[PDB]
From Swiss-Prot:
Top-level lineage group: Bacteria
Record EC number: 2.1.2.9
Classification of source organism: Bacteria, Bacillati, Bacillota, Bacilli, Bacillales
A GO term from the CC aspect: cytosol
Family: Belongs to the Fmt family.
Functional description taken from the UniProt entry: Attaches a formyl group to the free amino group of methionyl-tRNA(fMet). The formyl group appears to play a dual role in the initiator identity of N-formylmethionyl-tRNA by promoting its recognition by IF2 and preventing the misappropriation of this tRNA by the elongation apparatus.
Protein name: Methionyl-tRNA formyltransferase
Binding site for (6S)-5,6,7,8-tetrahydrofolate: 113-116
UniProt-listed NCBIfam families: fmt (TIGR00460)
GO MF annotation: an example: methionyl-tRNA formyltransferase activity
PROSITE patterns: GART (PS00373)
Length: 314
């Protein structure tokens, strides 16, 4: 909108990059960027400038990377910049009341769920895994309590049949940067009406513990399918075969003709073996990663293991 608007952006991963980029391309005066310290990435676990740090330094925007922004010395740096608006996206630090109460047009967050649903760290994983009809982006005010601030704007994004969590990440990120661009002028011009969240309707998308990665074969084949794709490609669901913990990357929903006990390998095909579930919908594992081995298609796995029918997983 205007170069008259000083903006500070706070974000770390790739999710936040389109948000920051769109802010810049919009013409806003981005005076500073706050990102997390650089953390190891990849198979090799290499230390790497955060995706936001990289994008920011392409423009020559100063990057603050405090261990904890909630500390005086660190947040005073931010207070010094005197931003008129603070935007955050996927910023995993506690923003102090001092910073919150500071800017003229408030501190706004771009959140990857339709609040008050799926507050917290893993709303994208949760939406898919819960077999959500549609998810979206919420842009709301930042307060003390996590994701509990008044809602400014929202947008809906459909979850397609073959969506992975990683693919919805890009979709929600792209839709977030857009909604923000459409939001900021409306916000500043007072055309926006903050909607207090209904605490009755609040659900928390808590961070995925390893015990939640474990495939529950007892559930419907429809649920196991959304469980597998909802954890793809981070942090990936797992099960057990021949004693090995096997990361299950992908599975297809296929009919099982004779209803058997869940977890049982009922059918063997060319591209994978079929496993029984809690209902009429079976799950054919086509892509998997046994412990200590690289990710592979079940086609290659089958050639080397051949788990015979009747064997149970888990």
């Amino acid at each position: 909108s205007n170069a008259m608007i000083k903006v500070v952006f706070m974000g770390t991963p790739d999710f936040s990059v389109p948000v920051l980029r769109r802010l810049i391309e919009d013409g806003y005066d981005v005076i500073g960027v706050v990102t997390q310290p650089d953390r190891p990435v990849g198979r090799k676990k290499v230390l790497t400038p955060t995706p936001v740090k990289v994008e920011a330094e392409k423009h020559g925007i100063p990057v603050l990377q405090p261990l904890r922004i909630r500390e005086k010395d660190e947040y005073e740096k931010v207070l010094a910049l005197e931003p008129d608006l603070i935007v955050t996206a996927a910023f995993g630090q506690i923003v102090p009341n001092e910073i919150l109460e500071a800017p003229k047009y408030g501190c706004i967050n771009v959140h990857a769920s339709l609040l008050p649903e799926l507050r917290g760290g893993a709303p994208i994983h949760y939406a898919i895994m819960e077999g959500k009809e549609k998810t979206g982006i919420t842009i709301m005010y930042m307060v003390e309590k996590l994701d509990a601030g008044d809602i400014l704007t929202q947008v809906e994004v459909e979850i397609e049949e073959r969506e992975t969590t990683g693919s919805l990440f890009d979709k929600l990120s792209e839709a977030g940067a857009h909604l923000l661009s459409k939001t900021v002028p409306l916000l500043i011009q007072g055309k926006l009406e903050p909607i207090k969240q209904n605490e009755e309707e609040v659900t928390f998308a808590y961070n995925i513990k390893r015990e939640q990665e474990k495939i529950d074969w007892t559930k419907t084949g429809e649920e196991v399918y959304n469980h597998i794709r909802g954890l793809n490609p981070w942090p990936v669901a797992y099960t057990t075969l021949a004693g090995q913990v096997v990361k299950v990357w992908w599975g297809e929903k296929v009919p099982v003709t004779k209803s058997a006990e869940a977890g049982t390998i009922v059918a063997i095909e060319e591209d994978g073996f079929v496993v029984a579930t809690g209902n009429e919908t079976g799950v054919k594992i086509t892509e998997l990663q046994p412990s200590g081995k690289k990710r592979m298609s079940c086609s290659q796995f089958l050639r080397g293991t051949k788990p015979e029918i009747g064997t149970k997983l888990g």
